[PDB]
Amino acid sequence: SSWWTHVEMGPPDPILGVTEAFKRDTNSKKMNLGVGAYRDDNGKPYVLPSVRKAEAQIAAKNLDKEYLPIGGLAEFCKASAELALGENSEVLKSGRFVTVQTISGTGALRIGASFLQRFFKFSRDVFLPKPTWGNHTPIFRDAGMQLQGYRYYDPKTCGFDFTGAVEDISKIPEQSVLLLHACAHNPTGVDPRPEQWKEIATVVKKRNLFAFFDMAYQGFASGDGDKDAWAVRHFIEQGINVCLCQSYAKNMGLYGERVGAFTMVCKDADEAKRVESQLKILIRPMYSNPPLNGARIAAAILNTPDLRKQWLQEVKGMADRIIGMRTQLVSNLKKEGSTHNWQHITDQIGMFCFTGLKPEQVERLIKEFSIYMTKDGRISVAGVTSSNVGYLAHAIHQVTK
Amino acid sequence: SSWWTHVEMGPPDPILGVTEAFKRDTNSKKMNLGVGAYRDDNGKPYVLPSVRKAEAQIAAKNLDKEYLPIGGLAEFCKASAELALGENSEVLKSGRFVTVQTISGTGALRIGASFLQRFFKFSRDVFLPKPTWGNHTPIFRDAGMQLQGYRYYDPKTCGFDFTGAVEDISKIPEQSVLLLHACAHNPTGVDPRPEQWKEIATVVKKRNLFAFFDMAYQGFASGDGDKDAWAVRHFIEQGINVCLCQSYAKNMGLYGERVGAFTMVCKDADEAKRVESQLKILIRPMYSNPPLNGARIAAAILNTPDLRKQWLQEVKGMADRIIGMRTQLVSNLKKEGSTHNWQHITDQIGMFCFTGLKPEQVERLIKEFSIYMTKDGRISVAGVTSSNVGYLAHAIHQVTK
């Protein structure tokens, strides 16, 4: 008959619809809280000037477009490791790691995920939080691993179930893989506190699970890179060789540039040497080598202080703006006479929020006020603006009252 | 007791190894025929001026860095389909196709396999030519598919084994997937003549195989993209619905920007819709979306007629440079007084040539004349210059007496 008449129509994407539902709304005070990227105080995309300064810096150099090592830019990988681990890190000094440039974080997760399939002989189960980013399960699943859950978010408190996650984690089998967001949870926004993080490390240490980290939001979450990477850095100090997925999409604004990295911290350099060769092997088949523009720009910013001083300044303008929107949404709800306790909205870190609002609530907001968010009740906080934090506080007061 | 001590050091890569062992040679007269990309007649990387003009066109536009959709830049996918099939052939005008942006040919290549592993009951076997690009096995292999070979290269003529290729394709179990190089075959450089293609296709049609084309060298091969894509377009006009992997790395010099496309021709516009949705579903797990810059450059060149006109002239000029060398090589090889038949060097297409040399001759060449190539007899004709065709022909004549 035909080849593809056996090919099913896929399921719709909530995220795409929400925006799409958004691009359809005619309203002039309409908001997209389904948006995945940082937006300026005008709800307009922002390209980081330092990125533009680097883009200029490179162009002045009349460079080539030659293939890149499988691992990526040498300068990028190394610089990217230092960003994550700190200047006076031992791992860097010891040499006991490999860093590879991957297509963004989603690239980081997948290579790492594959490498898990192929070489992680102590398990097939990757423990994801509850609830964790949408792409996570199908990243691992196609990757070839089993998936599992551990308590994280507590829905009544709109906070961290420390006892829950700590209790569940304590129940994870030994030498199993645990995925912990380094900071700025997607999509809840809930994070562990250092003392809480401290207690996790020991639990992982006692268990001997393997820790796999996603730091998709470094710098961007608080505006302090170091704090933001505090857990990854802590886990390693405490004897746990992690692996890290770094995304420069948000903190650096190279969303489409696709800058990312996967880092493995090993006991000794030789092991690193070995891991690298295999990391490569996995990759050649996937794409030959990763993209050129992004790494160069990222490298450019990190590797030249005046530019880096500037970017890291900008990251603060954004992180702080988000902090501000969060604080504002709450002051306003309280000013709209809203009864409830929204201090979660502020308690939370990053650009994603779990409002605790229920779908029937979402719908009132969506149909009645032209506002868009998914039904879990998360908002993307970067779709919020001075202009509209009020239209937002208003509806939420109205529905939740 | 480390995690990865069971992880062993991988085997060395002959191509990467030859390139490096070339880099280590201290001779002034060394030649790198293992190089995987095009080089100027100065032995230098070439950034097409069309790309500089275009890069300025997009840069002056003050453009976004937003995520592209899963299938990438729409404009690039359509333009790339136009390029491959002709801005007008009906498949494009009926809309019975889907094109997604992929990370180059390789990326495009694996996404295609992943699609085959996921949605193809009909076979688990892929038939690739003996021999093919080295990364063919692994992309299919990692994808989950089974690999087999059909005769292609004739070791006696250093040419096409038409007779064997026909005999074998015919004997392929029906509805299996068979891989075809559209033009500029890697590593032989051997291409079927068009009439042969017509006879080849009926076999594909009668045995009703899925036609999986890899076209990374459209235009780069003969200087006429319409001629280079002729195999694919003919396969489509003869009624075989194919999938296509396009790379813009070689003929646009966009090696490291990682620009590619995966194309599917379907029965109707909707089937294309269902296949698009499912492609998108595969891709999101692999990396969420494809890179931005290269797609922009390629899109501009493709769509600004004056930039495009300059690009095609730069491509042929590029194209005849390699031809320039093969035609040059034979003369000198003849000038140096070689008895042997070197017509195969002129009959072949692309920047890759199978000379038929014995590993021992390569080895004398490698120590004695300092010329680097893989032991299979493969030369990268892009490493050969007007200057060194004399040095190379002299050397080859010397090893071949």
From Swiss-Prot, chains A, B:
Record InterPro entries: Aminotransferase_I/II_large (IPR004839), Asp_trans (IPR000796), NHTrfase_class1_PyrdxlP-BS (IPR004838), PyrdxlP-dep_Trfase (IPR015424), PyrdxlP-dep_Trfase_major (IPR015421), PyrdxlP-dep_Trfase_small (IPR015422)
Biological processes, Gene Ontology terms: 2-oxoglutarate metabolic process; 4-hydroxyproline catabolic process; aspartate biosynthetic process; aspartate catabolic process; aspartate metabolic process; fatty acid transport; glutamate catabolic process to aspartate; glutamate metabolic process
Thermal profile of function: Optimum temperature is 47.5 degrees Celsius.
Pfam families: Aminotran_1_2
Record key words, sorted: Acetylation, Aminotransferase, Cell membrane, Disease variant, Epilepsy, Lipid transport, Membrane, Methylation, Mitochondrion, Nitration, Phosphoprotein, Pyridoxal phosphate, Transferase, Transit peptide, Transport
Modified-residue entries (Phosphotyrosine), positions: 67
Database matches in CDD domains: AAT_like
Record-linked PROSITE patterns: AA_TRANSFER_CLASS_1
Positions of post-translational N6-(pyridoxal phosphate)lysine modification: 250
EC number: 2.6.1.1, 2.6.1.7
Residue numbers carrying N6-acetyllysine: 30, 44, 53, 61, 78, 93, 130, 156, 205, 250, 267, 273, 280, 309, 316, 334-335, 358, 367, 375
Cofactor list: pyridoxal 5'-phosphate
Signal peptide: none
Binding site for substrate: 36, 133, 186, 378
Job of this protein: Catalyzes the irreversible transamination of the L-tryptophan metabolite L-kynurenine to form kynurenic acid (KA). As a member of the malate-aspartate shuttle, it has a key role in the intracellular NAD(H) redox balance. Is important for metabolite exchange between mitochondria and cytosol, and for amino acid metabolism. Facilitates cellular uptake of long-chain free fatty acids.
Illness: Developmental and epileptic encephalopathy 82: A form of epileptic encephalopathy, a heterogeneous group of severe early-onset epilepsies characterized by refractory seizures, neurodevelopmental impairment, and poor prognosis. Development is normal prior to seizure onset, after which cognitive and motor delays become apparent. DEE82 is an autosomal recessive metabolic encephalopathy characterized by epilepsy from the first year of life, global developmental delay, hypotonia and feeding difficulties apparent soon after birth, and intellectual and motor disabilities.
Protein name as catalogued: Aspartate aminotransferase, mitochondrial
Native source species: Homo sapiens (Human)
